[PDB]
Amino acid sequence: KVGRNDPCPCGSGKKYKQCHGR
């Protein structure tokens, strides 16, 4: 459970929900 509000681990720049989480 990664902090959805934290920069996606993908290393793109957008937060989880703003990249992968979504």
Contact assessment for residue 2 and residue 16, using Cβ atoms and an 8 Å cutoff: yes
Extract the tokens encoding 11.
């290393």
Tell me whether residue 9 is exposed, middle or buried, using C-beta atoms within 10 angstroms of its C-beta: 0 to 12, 13 to 18, 19 or more.
Answer: exposed
CA distance 5 to 16: 6
Contact assessment for residue 2 and residue 11, using Cβ atoms and an 8 Å cutoff: no
